[model samples]
Target chain A: FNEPLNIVSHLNDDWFLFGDARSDCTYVENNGHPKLDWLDLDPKLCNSGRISAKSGNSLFRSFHFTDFYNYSGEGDQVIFYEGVNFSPSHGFKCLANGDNKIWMGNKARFYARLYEKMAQYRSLSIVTVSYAYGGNAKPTSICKDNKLTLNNPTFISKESNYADYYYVSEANFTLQGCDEFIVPLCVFNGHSRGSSSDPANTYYMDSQMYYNTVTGVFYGFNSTLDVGTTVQNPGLDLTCSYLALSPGNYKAVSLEFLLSLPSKAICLLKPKRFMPVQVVDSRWNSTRQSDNMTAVACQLPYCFFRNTSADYSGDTHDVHHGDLYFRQLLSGLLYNVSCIAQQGAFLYNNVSSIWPVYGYGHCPTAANI
Target chain B: FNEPLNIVSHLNDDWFLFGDARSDCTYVENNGHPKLDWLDLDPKLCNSGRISAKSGNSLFRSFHFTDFYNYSGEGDQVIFYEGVNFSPSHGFKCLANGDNKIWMGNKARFYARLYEKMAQYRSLSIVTVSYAYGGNAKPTSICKDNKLTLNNPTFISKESNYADYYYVSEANFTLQGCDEFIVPLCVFNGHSRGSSSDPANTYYMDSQMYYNTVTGVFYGFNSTLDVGTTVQNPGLDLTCSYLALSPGNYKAVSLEFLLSLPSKAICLLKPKRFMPVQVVDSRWNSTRQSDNMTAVACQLPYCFFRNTSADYSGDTHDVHHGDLYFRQLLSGLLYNVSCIAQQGAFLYNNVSSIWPVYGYGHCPTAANI
Candidate 1:
């Protein structure tokens, strides 16, 4: 089976052809010149032919002969010569109804208009050119070109621009003979273009040439072709975590999630979990002080309360009264504290300790304790 | 001038002596035994004497004989030998009120009780030993010991414990003769202990031996001592910056300034700057959308508004209307946008652009635009 043809356009202004096709296609060397293609038309039609073609079903159209004829004389437009037998030995001729002719030296002028029409047309099959009926040449060989240079290329979106394309300042072919030959370029339809018969590749490519969709980088033009190579996208992993708000501060608490991707892909974050309640209270007096009774009901990895007040007072001295309460969200287990008070002369009357209060219930209240 | 005495105690138990003194101190070799010192006491007092000493003016007191006698009996308590005539050749004889004798081989047992009293009493002068009237020996040499080993030492505070000290699991003196001589330890008053004559150093140190007050680390023991070496504290720098709250969220915004220090010094954070105002509003209709009109009155390094709506619409197409207002805090300069409208069939009837609206004033109103 043959690989589908790829017709890349730049901002509806420039066009390029790559990949393979079954019929009605031109074969050009890795060099810029056409290798096996000739044009033929009836004398009756050529007398008044405007050489019109449409780019897919869009309003865009290419007037090939009109553009070429206005820029150069009819004899220099050798691409429209009306016979399969035309050759360099016979010199150039425009076999139209009128007395039109072209010389061999003027062949270079026909190429600028020729490539311009190729870029504007959506399908290579519509424009008459050399066709490999049996699809002999590999798509890799047909698309390979070492000296093509693109400058100042910008990625454009279909919704923002008229179509998904690349707008480049210039696309020059710096070959030995074709010094100033430039072909402006873009990858239409979001980085990849394919005919009806083939699946779309991640990048604009034939078997050898590659243009990365995400990074806007090109590979395997003049270099060795790795036939089945796939582009490696930068890897990504995300984590969700929480930042504790300072206590006694009355500000709204928020959680933010961020994503980074190489291709400027838009990402939307929708939170699945709701906010949890966090309550804290404290009490102090001359004889004793009970500070920071915090109860947190959070659905997170780990949650617990740490008491610095008890540590502030040495293990045993005076009346250091405090309690620790903890609850496990997943297991539905609650750890509560029990407080006991006694009358003593030395003020070592109050005592407290923690114990597991099984099942799900509210944390122990200060009065209850 | 000589370096002052450094008596480092662990908690209220272990005691260590370092630094120079003018009188009343025995010099011990770096190998953990008395080098150039001999005991001399009044025969009458030695006959019934119990070596008594005070640590500073605190209620704590050290009874040398009572503890040594209870541990190993008379002959092992050679440290209390009486008279200048005594020597290892003459054997240890306690010429007390009654006949109390000790052998030379039992001399090793005297150190356990000897170092214990050293840690408790704050002043080394009151505990009489070898008096160097001329101050011949450097404090570095007097304090150096290669075989001292402190295990599991803990920093303690004076208010929490009875006195500021280090509580060690064991302070073992691993000398050849003394297999298990342990002196419990603390840096009594914070990290440094100086005699009345000398200024307090950042660490507890003599000319040679050194102990860090903050890190509970020791240096310059048994090795070549750099006499004038100063302890280098881990450096600290604090910075205060603001975290911008996500717009349209109504949580309390707080700025946190964090400090990191090697010593567990208590640090208090007092913010000199108050919270500033941050307001944002948005409006949208079918024809045009004006989003995120933010008025931020913040005292920060940099504050400005960015409008992505204009760029969202290509240079010109429909009635893409938006405004940007900015105010400079230092210069009191304001930049505002002006709008003009005209009647047209197409939706390109409205226009807007930014202009410097000099002086201080509120941002232009939406209705005025």
Candidate 2:
């Protein structure tokens, strides 16, 4: 009934597809050529009000070819703000959009933005969108109080090592001129995605959604956080916030899942697959306290073993997890998702006492994907 | 459907009224008064096997008038077992039962038991039970690996200060003699109790409940974990757990409270009070994760406030918050309650963010209790 009280929003109608941080974005001089800087995009072009549109060629081309649009083709006109601004504030005064969309991911460039006040300090915001097509991202850390560093002890060590594979995307949502703030970063867990054929695999993902009473600014990314792995039967531990979902009545949101592999001409006799997605919601619908995928799955020979702990596995990462992230896709809609006095977790065949149960079944041999 | 697999029980069917620790429990000797300890009770009597009988004169006289009963009470029967015991084995070996029931609270006596390994190490467990007849307790820490001294960092500071009072009770439940274990201490928050007329000012409470897997030994205590003040519409952030709850039917129990004012001539014009005790059940029925007591509550002007803190007000040195601890006098069938899937916090008229809410109505000005 109280829509305004429970409503959330994506900071800006913008999303970014970071190139694998491995390539040009990180080196800046990589093997020493001025690397194609993802952060060099004009913030103005990214101000498009089309909140749900995917980051495509229109914006990618803007940074890809500067003169194609309005540009002096000269020096840097980048404006930056640092730290918090806290004075007497009233309503929401929209802040300036920083470099909102980065076409690629890079470590040095990520840190450069972190150092030059472009990180959380620049009023920049990015929402991760998970759609019908399969895709995913993992939120590494959600830090507060101070700025984060590449060497921060808690930084995921192996995450930054891969350039093309960006584990996270962040944004600094601030009121027009209010300072006095904490470094806001939301961390997300991984593995969730789906396609038209797999409609039941619908998912959402998000990180660090906060309403700062001091600045009267709501800072967060709204996206569908869907994390799961493909098996004859998939067990997804879908974890994300409303900031990552499409607008809908979450109270009535039901879970339906699918698990299938690309069929082979010779294995036409092999059967398809399916699994049940059991979701357990606490206070918020988008951020599930527990979930599980259950079905009798067949183990395929292609699924080889890897030496890695449950929460982390290097090369076999995708073999174990998946999640879909989204933001602002459903704006100005009522979802009445918060409950006053309720808390619980999800359970599958796994032990309910273990809290979050994330698992996946294997496809039968000869059932190639 | 699988009751055996998803069932729980109180470690000991015995709930004794402990003499608040302010007297004999925290100190081993105050010139040695030959303290008749609770942990020194005859196990045969504690194990009459009637787990649901209220503590009365039978056991009361056993400890109270020991000098008045079986004589030749020379020194003390001190059997101490301190620290962890991790051996591969299992069974329900009924340990010693000190004084099963104490008529009152004491300091020196409480400590004397500790010195003889009478805490959890002594197969001893104590809890401060709060009833509608209104009362409560403060739990004392029973450390392992080493003997507890009055100077031990985790020991309750001054449990014996209040004569004839005890804030906690405990018992030891071992599995194959495994020494290393997590002291499963579950906590809950609340404010409950009723004025006159309305006896159904219902309640649900619980703390550390232990399960001995091998022997199937379950142990737990029921108490009113009520915490509140006078703020018209009140709230409480009652937090507790049972490992975690599963997604299934929970229609097994109910809550019944007991409160006594120690009054005979009551005011006829006073309005009787009521408080709806909302119990959040996790894995066990005894300890509620979140609970609430709402309704009219007439305060007693003569009720003075003590300097104590919420968590350890029983004896820990912290100040300004003290739980009004009570125990026994009323026991009956529990209030059968359960909610599926979703688990969470309590929400009153406030922001629903700030937790652990407790409040009361008023003492109609000049009306005396």
Candidate 3:
């Protein structure tokens, strides 16, 4: 049910604020006259109808009233002042921490923020936001060949209120930089409410942001806290702040990344080419002399990557999970071997990745050689 | 130099055959009266103009003539009989030994022959020939879905002439039979010279050949050694001679062949599909609990098949021959591993088959889990 506000037209009638206005007001009770309790107000503070407080803290004023009809004290109705307006002297600022550089087919994470350094206030209201790279609405403009994308977009506070700033603990971007390159500017647009009652009444703050190559600090802002200023500042005057490198500079680093990948992950990427299989006969020595002349059922590993083409043969099969087995004649005795590969190579269920050898002559022997 | 032939039109002038017709003829010289010596002829053989001999042995008859003009030790002209004509009582036959069974994507070897049996004499003459499957001119008709082709065609002796027959020590035919199937007949065509003087005078003996399922014998002949009998008898009456089985019946045998393939040969064939890579921690126990708390530079194997597609990235690379090394975190320590595959898989020289592992998180530790 909606609470009614008590409004008195006559000079002798009493009045009191209701609902949200009374949420922070104080009340007292009179024992003698409960219905006619007098409500007292702090005239010195109430005249301005505002309060100052630090960010994240609540503000409230209380009043006490005495009843005329009752000899004992009685409760009085309470009313609170309206919320204070937040108008910081300075506008919003963009900032980031951590290196802005990234590699091709790889990602980097950094702490980023769009904030206003204001005192004694916080906003529970949301700000609609968007981002662009190098003054272009398209994200591709961030790089020389437009090979840049955001793995995770710039996030604004939507679920909860923020104290003077919105932030992403970890912002992510994927970029291609096999060649020398740089990301000069990042454009941010924040649309804030101008009137709480009118949804259409809104203002925008567009900031041209950049990261420092030497200092690793990312900070910037529009010339003024004005709406639609994105068109005025196109970031042409900005220097190359995000420093990335060519393969020559980062080859070792990139190789380290490659070396750290798990077997499955690497296998899925698929190597550029496969080297032809090489044979290492355990029965033979390095000098090509016979070592073990008679070893039967000796198992060896035969590894290979699966071809990308689909098999035309009707028998659809796959290499086994752990290993594959085959038999071959060595030293006049059949030897066994299992095929194995990194886990990632066997992602598919039905198709086969292991090919069986065909039409090879018998293994060489010392006598035969 | 062209030799002149002595032609006689009157009473006692002697004449003889020369060139290829007299290849085995004997020569004689005179002592006192040159060119007057008698080159004795085997009277028993000279009259009939032919002599008996075993296959591969030569037959010849020699005769001599006297010259009156040369008196001092001169050689008489030795005349040789014309070569004998060979007309075997029975016709030509086709035969094969070893099992007639085969598998799809695999081949089998058997000894085969197209020979004529005779008492004495070998034909040092060439024969033109062709072959068909089940009377169809196309080789595909050997199998049900027309998936049959000869790896090596039926070879007739073309370099050195055969005795009475042409035989291939190893005949190879690749057939597809994932499903139950049979090769009923193999038609053989032998075109032989009917007359040495005329190139156009040739006769073809088309044989409807079949292999015995019970006896493992491949043998047949035309109704008669008549020319062009291929059209008259089209192999419809022939029974299923070549025995083959579906995957169910021959899967094990086929697997044996596959297993026997050299790593290089098998890999070249390419497996149908690749199995995604799998991880096996050498430091961990069976239940995945950490067994090694601190191990440095531990190497592991990461195997994969090369993708058939070319790398769009400018960098071209391949996995190493024996193994590939990678660094990964296990128990807060980096580990290494190499990749290996069957020798056949890496047939290509420049293209890469081993894909590097990518984008995997660090190994799970017991504490983290």
- Which number leads on DockQ? 2
lDDT (Cα, tens digit) per residue for candidate 2, span A213-254: 221123232223233344432333312111211121111101
DockQ of 1: 0.01
Model 3 per-residue lDDT tens digits across residues B273-328: 22212111111112222221011111111121121121111111211100111111
Per-residue error (Å), model 3, residue A73 = 92
**lDDT of all predictions:** 0.17, 0.19, 0.18
Clashes of each: 22, 153, 66
Ranking by lDDT: 2, 3, 1
Q: Candidate 1 residues A97-125, lDDT tens each?
A: 11112111112222222322322222222
Interface RMS for model 1: 29.7
Per-residue lDDT over B1-369 for candidate 2, one digit per residue giving the tens place of the 0 to 100 score? 101111111112321212211211233434533342321122233333222112111111112121111111001111111100111111101111111111011112222222222112212222111212111333233212132111111112223343321233332221222222112222222443333243444433422233332212222223443343225423322121211111111111112221111000100111112111111110101121211110011111111111111222212211211112210101110111111001111111111121111211110110111
Q: Model 3 residue A9 lDDT?
A: 11
Could you give candidate 3's per-residue lDDT for residues A1-369 as a string of tens digits? Answer: 111111111111111211111112233334553321111112232322222112111111000001001111101111111111100111102211111221100111000010000000111111111232221112211112122222112222222332222222221233232222222222232333222353453343323332322212222333222222134432221111122222111110000000000000000111122211111112111222222111111111112111112211111111110011111110101111111122211111112323222101111111100
Ranking by TM-score: 2, 3, 1
> What's the distance in Å from true for residue B311, model 1?
68
C-alpha lDDT (0 to 100) for residue B186 of candidate 2: 23
Two-way lDDT contest, 1 vs 3, winner = 3
Our model 1 lands, by Cα RMSD against the true structure, at 40.0
Candidate 1 true-interface contact recovery: 0.00
